[PDB]
Design a protein around this ligand. Structure first.
Ligand SMILES: *[C@H]1O[C@H](CO[C@@H]2O[C@@H](C)[C@@H](O)[C@@H](O)[C@@H]2O)[C@@H](O[C@@H]2O[C@H](CO)[C@@H](O[C@@H]3O[C@H](CO[C@H]4O[C@H](CO)[C@@H](O)[C@H](O)[C@@H]4O[C@@H]4O[C@H](CO)[C@@H](O)[C@H](O)[C@H]4NC(C)=O)[C@@H](O)[C@H](O[C@H]4O[C@H](CO)[C@@H](O)[C@H](O)[C@@H]4O[C@@H]4O[C@H](CO)[C@@H](O)[C@H](O)[C@H]4NC(C)=O)[C@@H]3O)[C@H](O)[C@H]2NC(C)=O)[C@H](O)[C@H]1NC(C)=O
Ligand SMILES: *[C@@H]1O[C@H](CO[C@@H]2O[C@@H](C)[C@@H](O)[C@@H](O)[C@@H]2O)[C@@H](O)[C@H](O)[C@H]1NC(C)=O
Lengths: 208, 208
């Protein structure tokens, strides 16, 4: 019958003080004469009832896409609790159990390095500011760019990539009008990861 | 029933002269009561019988895995031709016609900028050499690193990322012993893409 998917909390949610991290159990392609879907939430094999499965949603598929959401404690996500989602139905000869948890493995402090635009790139109106983040484990992480306290718009970050030593790296590309980098403006690559002091580091990036 | 997955050729196989590009039809979850699988490859509608359904392979989870492979003209792919794989199983209520082609749109030339390690990283044993390749379209691309005619081993490349303007970028990180970067060796990032002159370009990178 149906098919189930289970989502981790966002990295920023598990690593920053007053946020609301939450793993999300999502059901697709249910029945119709059997819309009664039960969820059962277990933390490390212990059932918690502190959930809230927001109402069924009639889709144009003629399926009810139901969604449950467990607000989890950020220290729980980090200390590596397994969140198991049991989903019951009539279309199920047996329920569905999907389990999720932070990657297990020894965490690794990311190295953060800011790279200025290529000398070749100066013949362009816009320049590329680069942020290199390597040797982190596990892959969960967040990178933002700002200048003078205020955030920056025009950046994109590659996904984490498994490096040769079993750690991850990524790059973040920030784009600015050459004029801005020229004036001597300062920009900042911010990074959030668990193996960081206060879960937070940052690196400025300026011309000479 | 069974599912199907169609795959494009490898970028370098459609970009470099004497290579042999192939699209590949992979059928999975095949049974045993009606396990005869027939393929009827069509190219841009007008059928092709230059195909090959290389022999039947088993699988772990008691399921099955049947893979055909059409060798294809490289320039044909670049022109934009549609490649149709047509499967015929009996556990099917109907044959499948999954389609694949190159990304439509105006091919754009990649920009290639090499980037020396951050001064901060010179206090490490190994250093990171960085190749920023941006503004290309479509995403199909190949990147390689080398020095003195020999290739380099220790490198990794992020997947193409969609940029704010509809173009792709990526980075490639080459990792070497610091000592080799102090000698002032020359290192090169090579990029193969359909929009370049001879589908090829390369960028030096060396110590100041
Ligand atoms: C029993 O086992 C087998 C074996 O699989 C595994 O084996 C064991 C050992 C364990 O690892 C198990 O986890 C697992 O069972 C099962 O066979 C599997 O079948 C599933 C689906 O039923 C497949 O998932 C899909 O994978 C394809 C991509 O496949 C390539 O890449 C894989 C990794 O990404 C790689 O493992 C494969 O071998 C394969 O390799 C590529 O093949 C070409 C040609 O050979 C090669 O040249 C490439 O280099 C190579 N690439 C590599 C190596 O990475 C993926 O496309 C599927 O995702 C699409 O479809 C989904 C719908 O199911 C959808 O959810 C996704 O979002 C995505 O949708 C597509 O999105 C694109 C945009 O990107 C869009 O254009 C399309 O329209 C859209 N397609 C749709 C929706 O139609 C999906 O991830 C497994 O690959 C396959 N395993 C292998 C290894 O063959 C078997 O089914 C199992 N039985 C059971 C229990 O069901
Ligand atoms: C059926 O549709 C379900 C809900 O998707 C939503 O409604 C469809 C019609 C679109 O409007 C879509 O953009 C919405 O998100 C899906 O969750 C479900 O997977 C679909 N079933 C399948 C597998 O086709």
């Amino acid at each position: 019958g149906p098919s189930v998917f289970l989502f981790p909390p966002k990295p920023k949610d598990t690593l920053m003080a007053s946020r609301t991290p939450e793993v999300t159990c999502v059901v697709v392609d249910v029945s119709h004469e059997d819309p009664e879907v039960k969820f059962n939430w277990y933390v490390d094999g212990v059932e918690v009832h502190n959930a809230k499965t927001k109402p069924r949603e009639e889709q144009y598929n003629s399926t009810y896409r139901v969604v449950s959401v467990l607000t989890v404690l950020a220290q729980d996500w980090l200390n590596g609790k397994e969140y198991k989602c049991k989903v019951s139905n009539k279309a199920l000869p047996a329920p569905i159990e999907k389990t999720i948890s932070k990657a297990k493995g020894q965490p690794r402090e990311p190295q953060v390095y800011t790279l200025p635009p290529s000398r070749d790139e100066l013949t362009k109106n816009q320049v590329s500011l680069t942020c290199l983040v390597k040797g982190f484990y596990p892959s969960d992480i967040a990178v933002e760019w700002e200048s003078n306290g205020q955030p920056e718009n025009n950046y994109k970050t590659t996904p984490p990539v498994l490096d040769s030593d079993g750690s991850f790296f990524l790059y973040s590309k920030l784009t600015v009008d050459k004029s801005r980098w020229q004036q001597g403006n300062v920009f900042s690559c911010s990074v959030m990861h668990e193996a960081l002091h206060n879960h937070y580091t940052q690196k400025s990036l300026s011309l000479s």
